[PDB]
Structure formats: C-alpha cells, structure tokens
Amino acid sequence: VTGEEVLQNACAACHVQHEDGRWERIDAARKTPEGWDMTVTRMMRNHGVALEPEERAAIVRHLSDTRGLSLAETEERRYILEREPVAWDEGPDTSMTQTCGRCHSYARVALQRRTPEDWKHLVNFHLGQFPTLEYQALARDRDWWGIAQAEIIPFLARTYPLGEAPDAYADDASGAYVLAGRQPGRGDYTGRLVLKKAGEDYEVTMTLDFADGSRSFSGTGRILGAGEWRATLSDGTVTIRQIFALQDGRFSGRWHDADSDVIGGRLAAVKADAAPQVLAVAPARLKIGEETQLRVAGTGLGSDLTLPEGVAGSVESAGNGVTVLKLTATGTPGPVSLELGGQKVDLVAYDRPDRISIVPDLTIARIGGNGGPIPKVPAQFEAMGWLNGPDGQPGTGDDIALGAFPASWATDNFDEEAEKMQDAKYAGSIDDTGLFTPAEAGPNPERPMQTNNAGNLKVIATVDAEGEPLSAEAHLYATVQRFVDAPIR
Amino acid sequence: MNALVGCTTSFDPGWEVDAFGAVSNLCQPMEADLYGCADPCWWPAQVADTLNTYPNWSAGADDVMQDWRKLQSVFPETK
Amino acid sequence: RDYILAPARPDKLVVIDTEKMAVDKVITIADAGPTPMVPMVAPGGRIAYATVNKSESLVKIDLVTGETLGRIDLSTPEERVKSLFGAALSPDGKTLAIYESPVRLELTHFEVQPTRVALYDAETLSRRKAFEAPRQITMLAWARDGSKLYGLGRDLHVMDPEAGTLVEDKPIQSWEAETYAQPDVLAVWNQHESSGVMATPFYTARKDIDPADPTAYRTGLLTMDLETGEMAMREVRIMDVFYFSTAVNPAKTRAFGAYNVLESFDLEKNASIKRVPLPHSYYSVNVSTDGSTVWLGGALGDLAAYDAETLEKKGQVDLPGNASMSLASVRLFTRDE
C-alpha cells in the first residue's frame, strides 16, 4: 500500500484536501517517524479510523518520508528517539518546562515544526482531550488558558515554525560496514553491519564482537525521510531495535533490547572499504607501566604506527575493521596521542583515578511481572573513572575521562525514612555488572499499608587499586509501573 | 526530575516520585491512587485516562487490590 | 437517621446504613462507566442525583427502589461537555447547578469553549439557564438560603444564579500575599452537607523564611461557610504531611483531614488535636450528624468509621465486590428515622 492511497481512502474521510493540494492539518506540521506513528495511532484509537497493518505502516512511512525533519532539526533531542536511559530533559525556560514538559518530555515538543494556526490547534487539542490539565499541579496555580493563548501559542509558533521538509535519502546504503561502540554493563565492541536492499527496505545483519565473544542479529531496516534509520533484528528469542541517523554514508545512534529499552548500546559504522578512519579505541586508557592490549576500530587502518615519547609497543594484528596494538605507557598521567595509518588515536595515561562517579547518578527502575502484563524495568549503572586534570578541580568542567571501570555494586536505603521502611530489603538488588533488577509488582502484604516493593535507594560502586579510595553513589527510585507509554516519551 | 525523562513533575502527589523527592508520599499502595489518577486523567502520559482516551481501560478490575493484573499497558510494547 | 451514599465503579451508587454498619441498597445505573463522580441527595433522603458517564451525564434515581427516574446528557455531536467535579442541588431541591467545561468538535480540530454553569429544573430535568463561569472551578455549592452559587476556583467565586453573573470573588490566590506564598489548593470532594461548611486544606509557606528550610512550609485550612457566606483561611500547623480533603463537624468546632494519616484540628484554636495512621490511602472525609463519627472513603472500596474524639477506628463497611470509589464524592444524608 502507498501513502497517497491511505490519504485518499482513509484520511480524506475527515481531512479536507485544499485545491492547492495540501491537506488540512497534515500539511501544517512536520515531525519524526515516531511522532507520525503517535498521531496515526490517535486517529485509530480516538476517532475510529480503521487501518490494516499495511495501511498504518504505509501512511506513517509516507509522512516520515515527505513531512519529516532534517537530521539537524533533531540535534540535542535524539535521546528521546533512541530511548537513551542516561538523559536530561527540559524546555528553554521555566515557563515552557513546567507548561509543556510536566506530563511528557519537552523533547516531544522540540521535535516538531508547525504553522502558527496549527500550534494553536495543538494547544486546543490538549485542553479539549485532557480538560483536567488546567486543574493539575503547575497549571491550577495560574490562568492556564489565558496564558496559553497570549504566551505559549505565540512562543511555539515563533520558536518552531513549519519551514520546509528536507529531501528524502536517495542513495543505496547496501554493502558491508565496520562498526564500533559500547554497551553499558558489558563493555566495548567492534563488529560488522551488512545491508542488502530489498524493494524499499534493507535486509540487515549486525554482528557484535566483544572481548569474550560474538553474536549476530538479522532483520529488516529502512531509511525514513532525510536520514532516520530504523530496523528490527533478531537472534533466537532475542529481538533488538536500531535507531540510527544516516549521514555521509555513516550510521550513528543507539540500538536496544526490544523487550527492555534501558538495555542497549551506542555505535557508529562506516563502509568497510572506506579510506583510513578511526571509529574508536578500546580501552581508551593506559595504566602507566603496564603493557596492555588495545583494539583500534576503523577502516583501512593498517599497521603504520607512530608513537609519542611516553609510549612504546607494537601492532599485533590488522584488518577486518580492527588493528590490535600492544602498548605500555611511562611517565606522568595525562592525554596521549599516537597515529595509525595517518589517523590520530587519543588515549589517557594514568596510575590511578582521582575519583569515580556513577552513571546515571539519578534514575528509576520499575516494579513488574508477578503475574501482571507489564514487565520489570531495570536500571543499568556504570562506574566511571576521572582525573582531576590540570587545575585539580576534583569534579568540575575540565576533568579527564578514563572510562568505565569494573566494580563491586551494592544498594542501601537513601535516608533514615527509607531505612525505617526497609526499602533496600524489598526494592530489589543489583548484580556485579551494575545491573539493578526491581522487585515484583502489586501490593505487598508484608509491608506497612501493604505498600508496593517501591523504594528510595542509593547505589554504591567501589573500584580498584592504588591508594584505593574510590567510591561513588547514585540516587535510585525503585518506583511503580507506567500504564501509558509511547514511541516518544 | 529533568533527569527522570518520561516521568511526571505534577506532584498531586505524583506518579514516579513525590514532591519530597521520595516515594513514601505516593499512594500506599499505588493501587489506592491508581483510579484517582486514571478517572480524571491526572497523569495521562503515565496512567490511562478513562475520562476520555481510554474509557474502558479498568473494565473488569473494580476491586483494584485484587484485580490489578487485569490492567494493561496501552503501549503495544515496542521501542 | 444517618446514611452514606457512596459511588462504586463502574456503574453503582451504594447506600450504607451507618447504624447497622452495612449496605442498605445498591443502585445500578445504565451507561454510567467508568464511575459515577458527584452524587447529591435531595432533602428527605429518597431521591438522589449523580453525574456519570465520564462526567458528561447526570441521572436522577430513587434511592429506595433503585430505578433511574431521568437523565441529562450534557454532550452533543459537535460539543463534548465535562461537568468534572461541579454539580450541586439547591437547598430547596428544585434546581441543579452543573459546571460545564466544553470543547467544540470540528472535523479535524478541537475548539475549547468558555466554561459555563448550567441550571436545570430538578423535577423535570430541563435545561433552564446557562451562563459563562470562571475556568478552573472544581466544586459548586449553594448558599443555604439558595440566593448564591459558590464555585471554588483560583478564587472563591460568588455567582448570582438568577442573574447568571459573577458578583464577587473571595481572595484565595492572593490571600495574605505579604506573608504567605500563593496557596496551593487541590479539592474535588463534595462533603460539606453535615456542617454547611465547604472546607479544604491548602499549602503555603512563610515568605520571610528560607525556602530550603522545612519550617517554612505551612498547612492552612480554607473554610467557606455556606450559611453565613463567610470564607476564612488560616494556618493550622507546620506542613509535615499532605491531606487530600477535609470535612468539618456540625458544630463547626473541628475539621478532619485525611490521606495516609487522619488528623483532627481545633477550629477554635486553629491547631492540631490528634493524628493517627491509616491502613491505606483514603481521599474523602465526612462527619456524622451527631458529630461523633468521622467517615473516610475514596481510593479503594471500603468506608472506615473513626471516633471523632479518640480517632480510634470504630469499624469498616466494604462496598460490594470491594468496588473502588476512586476520587468520586461520598455524601452523608439523613432520613427521618
């Protein structure tokens, strides 16, 4: 089925196509593929618009291909599309953050462009569909409707004007690619991404090579609009989703477990036959006076290695997107760079980290399972190491990152109140990889008021060697299930 | 909680977290505040609003403490 | 003789005999889901009214026979109307005042309409008047003499039902602004019948105290006396806990607030008397005619009775099938023995 077909056979039942060709509402807004998915879903849910699976997919794809955003228009807000768990969401000012980011992310707003009249219709949609909106906290404290008309609508119109849709990707992304990235909780990886065009989609296989092993996933993907790549792949009973941006023949983005989007990894991929280019090096740190194995991922790297003063070593292997080095740093801690195949490789020499932090340092986990239809939502943590830097600055905007370090993980009550409730006892547990698994959902008769296995927790990580005074904490809210969720939160 | 992406910041008493930055002021148990949130669609981005969008969401679960397992997520479970 | 009229999802109104501490009658309403919202009892305790159907309709029912006597549908094909939490029957039982939050439903867009108050003749259930009203009004309550209609919004709005106008605003948002931060008021519970006083807790803070200091936050009590027509607002304690609603006793000497704890307040000293914990979260609060029993409801499916002086639990009445009351209003009425 084609988009034009669904527009005329389903959408036209209510949406008027003006004499100029443009459609009422439809041609007065631009948004991401996820955005269009949500709008079409509402037409089906709220207005009884009957759509077969093929029609639904066709219209959403058509809208993404003709009325989407450019990749630049998504800058600073891609976290919401990637379902990135380590993120921060806010509006341009207190007024917009409180008014438009108190239910769903403000990113949902920032990833749209509309005419002034349409932004007006959108605000009317909100108070019309959610009449108690003006009675809720942050709304009943002001003349919500008056302010919406005089300040919010004009702000949206002025800040996110319609503009023009970008041209759709028009090349053939088929071929073999080399990739590199990392998965919080497991580590760094290299690999391959192979695309094979099939009609308007692509057959896709992604292979992830970690230090301890490899695994491949196969499925289907497609490029939406200017450069939004979306794909679903599987291996056995495991299914993952790829949310990448494709620009200049290079993929970048995040992939995640289809059943638990908090679990996933980030990567970049370029054509395997490309000129010398470094994607990443793992590890990116060198423990002074200790020979270590380093995997430099990239294309056409070869074995021409030029090392600086404080580092000596050699190339152990090369080819297939990875050149393995054997290096040893000597001297004072700090940034160190070398060249391989004419490309710069940045590392960091150190004897011991000045401190470690927990990423994320504030997050949630959600109870689930227990016979219910909503699965638990875990929380992944990683202990990051740092170097004070030149100005000492134990924890400021100039520190040097050392990367994730293996560590011992533990949970405990955040404060006295949580301890009285024994939250740490019923809220769940964290394993040796920093993965926190929440408890069963539903009222727990063992707790006071038969309350849920929710909890106000603290996550503590402890790393290794030299001076060994490395510990960091994170604030974790083991909270309740969410019954409403969407492509864009 | 700008860091708690996807959670609500309207604390009446809230859904993911309460006004005191904890979870003890949320309904005890959550099931006791579930319909108070659902029926007037107080947190439509987190709990199904039966006032307009999902009128039949709680059908068959009148005894929320006993039948909470019947309540479904309205998101087909995807990315 | 005291009785309680409590809504139970998805389509019921339960009459509870407080003396027998048992269910008296279960009224089932057609096309009422997901839950009745605001019930009202006419003088005599025989006829009642209740908003239902996502607050878009209202039915008249016979509390003894359980039959639906009539119905009012506020919505039309081109305009969806929500009464939300605003619906009140006049003291003489002849007029229903219904709040209306409307949205016009065009082909492919919505058009929010100005909020209104509609007056219906109770006996015939006929729409008799409609006038624009302030937005953000939760509860509507009649003056005891029936000459004024009050609407609790960003200010206490005093409307003249006969003229269909807003004649006076009693300050809420600006109350003692030189001393206190703008009052935060969350109130959707209709439960003033036993005292003639519509009351709600509100939250604020002393402006001259460090906002980072807990001592800065205070809990106040707002009381709108429907008989005298006077509204009072005053601090009653330093805020350490939150209450969803409050009810005043017939004597007008005490107020009781509840959520996760139950607390009694002395309205003569404007101070706390006692506090006790609760087995689970509750929303609604009412007081018996003799003022000796405090009734908690809402949230789940049980009405809990507490001694007004000791706050000791006296008993519990479970609704049929433990059907939840959600945030619907729970009323207490009487029948001549």
Ligand code: HEC
């Ligand atoms: C009548 C039964 C409809 C059909 C068929 C379709 N749409 Fe619709 N649409 C309808 C209404 C009443 C509204 C306004 C209220 C709302 O839910 O927003 C809309 C609105 C839209 C919009 C704008 C939404 C916004 O973000 O403000 C879009 C982009 C839209 N509709 C798209 C759309 C498409 C692609 C349809 C064919 C599958 C379609 N609509 C059909 C009513 C009806």
Ligand code: HEC
């Ligand atoms: C809670 C009461 C909300 C507030 C405050 C705002 N929004 Fe919202 N928004 C809410 C929901 C529950 C939904 C999903 C509705 C559905 O069923 O599809 C949305 C959706 C949006 C969208 C997407 C609409 C589309 O493209 O089809 C946008 C662009 C949006 N919201 C914008 C927005 C703005 C600008 C707000 C401040 C005035 C705002 N929302 C507040 C819930 C709530």
